[PDB]
Design a binder for this molecule. Structure first.
Ligand SMILES: O=c1ccn([C@@H]2O[C@H](CO)[C@@H](O)[C@H]2OP(=O)(O)O)c(=O)[nH]1
Ligand SMILES: O=c1ccn([C@@H]2O[C@H](CO)[C@@H](O)[C@H]2OP(=O)(O)O)c(=O)[nH]1
Ligand SMILES: [Mg+2]
Ligand SMILES: [Mg+2]
Ligand SMILES: [Mg+2]
Ligand SMILES: [Mg+2]
Lengths: 194, 194
């Protein structure tokens, strides 16, 4: 009866792409980098790998570092929108995020970040999973174009959240975007209600 | 098409009740304790709270401590059964566990424990959530009797895994138990297949 919305963390709430570029440039000032307008394809490390040998591993070392996830800046409007969304009648919001392979810091820091921006009570809304298709909901707002896993027919409609890496992608017509948090997310939610 | 089984961590894979009692008795040797045969009700801290003032907070301090989750012993047969289960044709296994409120160690250590007992590739199967009803599957094997949340009609059948705290409970007849990992878990899975 309550509409259930899964909101992705990196690329939707937290500015992974911007945080990564800043920290990559500071740590590796003599390496070439990819400006955000030139990002293509979901995986940062894949595009850096194509740019030169060794750069995939150096990119990965940025997000494996302590405080990388914790120090990510919220995307404009994201905290405000999710706070409002969760406060809506008949609306349950979960934050659905996948941890990286190296798990020393990342899970912890994601909990710490949600506490910092949404408060202790919002920690109850976090779902950490590598497979988003096994989480059931009406909507999934997520910047990754292709979201697959063990469930061939997910219950959610995936709404693509615009990010530098996907902004040029033509989607298969049924598929829909949320262009930013300034865009009309309430209309998207309402289209799914009874 | 693949049968999806959610296997709970504490009380099913990891011996939380035994680990807790041992560490509580070592840290607080002059306090009364609850032998496992006398445990009743899911929440350890609630029963300790009834035993005397201040004991809820002392119990909580055990599982909030560094290395509590990591050092939990697997329950008999649990690692072997889950390894076999995941290897079965047309069978996907996820480990579904809720973190405690204090998140400094617990998420991290749960990933570390799964790596230790199941290997790096099994980390892909972990689902960390406070609300298990929003995870879709055919089965949930979990020692907690009452599992509720945002989804009023979960897709899974909850099979109650026997634990000291629930072993005397009469269930509402449709409901089923897995009595231990030595019990016939394959028959339970097969009853759900096409
Ligand atoms: O190039 C990358 C690499 C990683 N990630 C975030 O980390 C999760 C695990 O790879 C990815 O699933 C994603 O986290 P999420 O969007 O689920 O919070 C990126 O965002 N971009
Ligand atoms: O008395 C207690 C207190 C906590 N827990 C485990 O920690 C999660 C959060 O409370 C509880 O959900 C449970 O973890 P899970 O079974 O999901 O791995 C217990 O097991 N017993
Ligand atoms: Mg993302
Ligand atoms: Mg609400
Ligand atoms: Mg349990
Ligand atoms: Mg299998």
């Amino acid at each position: 009866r309550a509409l259930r919305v899964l909101v992705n963390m990196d690329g939707v709430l937290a500015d992974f792409e911007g945080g990564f570029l800043r920290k990559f440039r500071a740590r590796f000032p003599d390496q070439p980098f990819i400006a955000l307008e030139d990002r293509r394809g979901f995986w940062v490390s894949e595009q850096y790998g194509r740019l030169r040998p060794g750069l995939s591993e150096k990119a990965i070392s940025i997000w494996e570092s302590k405080n990388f996830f914790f120090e990510l800046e919220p995307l404009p409007g994201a905290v405000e929108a999710v706070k409002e969304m969760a406060s809506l009648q008949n609306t349950d919001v979960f934050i659905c995020t996948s941890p990286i392979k190296m798990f020393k810091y990342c899970p912890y820091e994601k909990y710490a970040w949600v506490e910092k921006y949404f408060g202790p009570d919002f920690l109850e809304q976090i779902v950490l999973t590598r497979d988003k298709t096994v989480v059931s909901a009406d909507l999934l707002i997520d910047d990754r174009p292709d979201i697959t896993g063990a469930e061939p027919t997910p219950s959610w409609e995936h709404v693509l959240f615009t990010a530098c890496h996907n902004q040029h992608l033509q989607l298969q017509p049924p598929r829909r975007r949320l262009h930013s948090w300034a865009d009309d997310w309430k209309a998207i939610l309402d289209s799914k209600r009874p």
